Symmetry: C3
Subunit: 446 residues, 3 copies
Amino acid sequence: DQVRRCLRANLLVLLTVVAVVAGVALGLGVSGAGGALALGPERLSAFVFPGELLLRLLRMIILPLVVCSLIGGAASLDPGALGRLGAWALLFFLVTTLLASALGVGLALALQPGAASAAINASVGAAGSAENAPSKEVLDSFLDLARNIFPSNLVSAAFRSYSTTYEERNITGTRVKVPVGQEVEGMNILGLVVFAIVFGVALRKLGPEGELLIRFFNSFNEATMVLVSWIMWYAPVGIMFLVAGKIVEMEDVGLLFARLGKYILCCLLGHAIHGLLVLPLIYFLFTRKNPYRFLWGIVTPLATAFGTSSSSATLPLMMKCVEENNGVAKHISRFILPIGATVNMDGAALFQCVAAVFIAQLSQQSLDFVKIITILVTATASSVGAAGIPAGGVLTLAIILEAVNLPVDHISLILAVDWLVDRSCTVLNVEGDALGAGLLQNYVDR
Amino acid sequence: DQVRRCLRANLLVLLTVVAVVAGVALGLGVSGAGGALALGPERLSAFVFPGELLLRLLRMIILPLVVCSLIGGAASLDPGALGRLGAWALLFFLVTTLLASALGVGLALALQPGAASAAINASVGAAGSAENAPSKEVLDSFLDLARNIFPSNLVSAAFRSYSTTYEERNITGTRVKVPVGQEVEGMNILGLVVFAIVFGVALRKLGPEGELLIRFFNSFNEATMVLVSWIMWYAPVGIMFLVAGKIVEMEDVGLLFARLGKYILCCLLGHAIHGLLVLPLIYFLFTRKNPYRFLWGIVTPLATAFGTSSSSATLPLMMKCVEENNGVAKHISRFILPIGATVNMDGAALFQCVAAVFIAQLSQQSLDFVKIITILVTATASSVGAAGIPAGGVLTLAIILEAVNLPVDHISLILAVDWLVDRSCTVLNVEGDALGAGLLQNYVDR
Amino acid sequence: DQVRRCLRANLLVLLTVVAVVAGVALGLGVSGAGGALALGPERLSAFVFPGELLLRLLRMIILPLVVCSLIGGAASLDPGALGRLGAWALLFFLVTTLLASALGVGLALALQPGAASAAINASVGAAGSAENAPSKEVLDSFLDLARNIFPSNLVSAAFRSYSTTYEERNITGTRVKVPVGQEVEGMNILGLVVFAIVFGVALRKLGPEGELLIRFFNSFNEATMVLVSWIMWYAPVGIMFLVAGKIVEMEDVGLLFARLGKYILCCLLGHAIHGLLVLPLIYFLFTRKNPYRFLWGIVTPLATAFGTSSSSATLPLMMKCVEENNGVAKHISRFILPIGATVNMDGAALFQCVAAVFIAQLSQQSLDFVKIITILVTATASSVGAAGIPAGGVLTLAIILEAVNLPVDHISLILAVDWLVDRSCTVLNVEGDALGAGLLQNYVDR
Ligand SMILES: *[C@@H]1O[C@H](CO)[C@@H](O)[C@H](O)[C@H]1NC(C)=O
Ligand SMILES: *[C@@H]1O[C@H](CO)[C@@H](O)[C@H](O)[C@H]1NC(C)=O
Ligand SMILES: *[C@@H]1O[C@H](CO)[C@@H](O)[C@H](O)[C@H]1NC(C)=O
């Protein structure tokens, strides 16, 4: 019939979502047959490997993609039009992140997740084990991000970022701390974006002298998009083992719900309202077109983000699916998506704002109005250079709580349920710019 | 006369082999005049340096050669012909390595190197000094190689590979070990081969759009082959100091022979039979042509392998000498030699199989038939990703002995005679693919 | 009037030198209002940051500049003319460094900086804190530099150099030390220069086959020079915070003068005589043209060197200002300046020679004539690969003093006044080759 007509023509849509429900089904099946203790750590890592091979194999594409697509992108058009394009671009992610994070305030205020339950049983959450975090100061973090932009060595910017630590070497008579930088390991995605855009304007500022080299990076981009076409077919195999691997690791019974499940129901709902009902309403108001036609065409990287739980490890999947399944130009789509991959971490900002209210709803705190705007503007500003580190939501939450001087006594309670909720973060994180990609397609016609 | 006619026209053949006998002559001359103690470690490293400068200066060529020649190679012809070419290729190294390693079994079985001699005086071999090796588990090693293929960061794949260690951090109540990866330093040659072939097909899959970039990497390959032409003339100077440097370092008297010299006579003979009598017989059976005409034309990298004692540090020397001194096409020779440099370590597999029989010939062990095929199939499979580390034959021998549960009580006896026998490994290691290069030249005519 | 005519047309000359006097004015103003203790280390690093952002942002340009300009430079002309050009080039920096360092001998001999003052009060200088330096041996340092030329991995040559340390692992019965190399972090500028020149000849040795790739690196150089045009305008903002940052850090009162100020008056005068009176006299003798017309046109990188206090972090500023403000050809100026940035550290050699006389003028030492030529030829030879490390003058002074066996008992006295005098080193260091750039412009006409 015609049911097999839409079956073959939408195979990637069908094969991906049948895999993510297979991972939950396989994951609960192994936990029902004993679990990780039934297998042991010998045969455990062999089970989680063929999914973990995908998350490794996909990250090697973004170094010859991000630094190569921006030069081919941001050299076709005029620099005055680019600053015209960049002004509407950078304004869009800022308004989205403020509106998403303020949604997390009132959703967590008018629900009270600090309920008389096992959530207020947080005496198990302290545990005296990993209390003394590094927890860098709030001035040094925003100082670090500006230093992380414009990297020191350009080859060093491909695998190691810049960070800062603290040394207690002042035993002069006053035991005070001093900062020192050591360049810990993790890919500096933000540092290479700001180079390639600045380098891309310089070819445009040259005349026909740089006509050879703009054709070079245009071609080098194009073969990579052929190479990522083959990666997409392995992605239904990998996500089946990402989800099923993670279920076996953590004890997902008794602590999933019935201990703090009011909080998980709160923060998933914040990801449910924003991006699925809020961002399509913004897209409908500017385009007067059906957003769910546009949203269905990019369903494969959204399920990939729920597999990988990484925002930057779905960027090549998104750049293909927006370009092919929906009508966008090449240069205008292969420009806004890399820069809009590491500046608009609003699903983090939705997560990071609620959890700070969550521990303040308990333990009797009084954030009436002055603390609300400080906890709003700091979360939308800290969520810029939060790309490389895996548990960035836990690490950058301490600098929120220090600047609004709330108790950080049990941050371990937000931890160990963040394999699930931050997995929903990257779904919403890569969803905003993709709608923002098609939003700029509207009035680029005029 | 005409003796000076063949002298000038075969200068590289004459000048190289007169240097390797000069290194043995110079090395025994310094050891006769006291030795390393007569010079002291101050003036010692100045003596070994101008050879060690060659082994450093040569390795910097293989990064813009391996990743550049494969793209220019594996993009001219069809992908269906490539998989046709790769199937005969990958089958050839597997049959060669099995036939070479099984030759080591019967040569070590029907000679009994565990003789009533100073070889069974292994009480000096234990010494209680470096017994507790890391000695990674046999599942984790083949898990590591698949993870070492498809590297994480492509810039990180140029100088640091991936490995795995063990941490004892499980003091939960059961003191068990856990694996963790840390990316130790050493060039990931295997990780870059599998990228450049996959990247090379992607240009072929593009039409005339990638016509610019295939001409780029074709040219970038060509200037490097001009640059390696100048390196070849320094090679008779360097090998004179590699050999003469190594003789002064180790005490080469009394322990060379007359302690375990039956073993060295056994394993050099295995390198003597295979590759000099076995591999020419295979080449004669498929080509009906004189193999020693072909074997004499590549005598300069074979003596370079006996100098450098490194398989991958003779690849640019081999790619020139096969292309010029013998009749092969450029694209078919500059493709099979990089991929056949890090997959066919059969001289290691000849070494690694005999030494496991050697310590089992002594200490009264009973490998009748079941242990023979396990010690055969594991040695031919572990010898794939053994490129970067210098003492790979000693390190990967422990994972052979664990999987066939033989005593590893004196592995230090195989050590400290491995400067000589593994120096004969790289001779046979780079000899197989060069014969395999001309073997594919036969029926590429049809 | 016409005073505003020369104001706008020489804005970079005016705006740069008004900033360096603003940094001394701002720096003494903050130290007068308490100082660093008045601010505290919290708000201290925020004050020194916008200057430190310049020194970071500028270093990322020299990797796609040094390795790219030399190939485009050293491939236009003939290799016989290049060796003709390189012979006059390498002779010029050697004669300059000998003449500059011998000027430091007689200026320090016939002034006696070891005066009966607080300089001979060096009992505060010992302090028993950091006496046990690594202080590598004099043979191993020149062995290290030759090994640092021709790097191991070409990607590894972009951010980590090679060095050597010492391990005490010989507890055989004689407690002696052994060298071992570990590749500490710092950009290998010298290792990439010697590759790109050798690689640049190889394109010239090819005919029209490499005509594509020489046009590639010619274009890739050109867009970088457009990119450094924008960096120059930020440089008056940065140098205002480099100088004012450094004044607040060190206690610049009482120890600046009146403790060892005879020495600082001696070594600044050596930088004052050479390069301002000696090198223009050499330039006048070969060109018969006004050197101060030529010297005024490059005043902006000279003040940048006094800001950054780094020789290699002014190379892109110098390559533009020589090319535009003065009449030189592009290929002959974008070749001699990178190779003449890391071979002619004569301002270091002026510094490093006087300080060794300085501690020998005190403590009653007898360098009559034999020690004078050894302290002269070693300082002009050690000052080759001294690029990457910040405090290279302190570190390489110990290998001078060991080879002329003077007491190293207070090397900390030369330290902590080296923020000022080595800041004058990089002024004279980048001044010699720029005069040498225009010196080769004279008889390139014939
Ligand atoms: C949790 O809180 C309830 C009351 O809300 C209390 O009865 C119970 O003992 C607490 N602890 C646990 C482990 O359930
Ligand atoms: C080595 O073995 C021989 C017997 O073959 C014996 O005579 C000799 O003492 C042994 N040497 C040592 C050091 O044990
Ligand atoms: C420094 O030297 C002067 C001599 O001019 C002497 O008066 C003073 O006591 C010395 N100070 C110290 C701390 O040695």
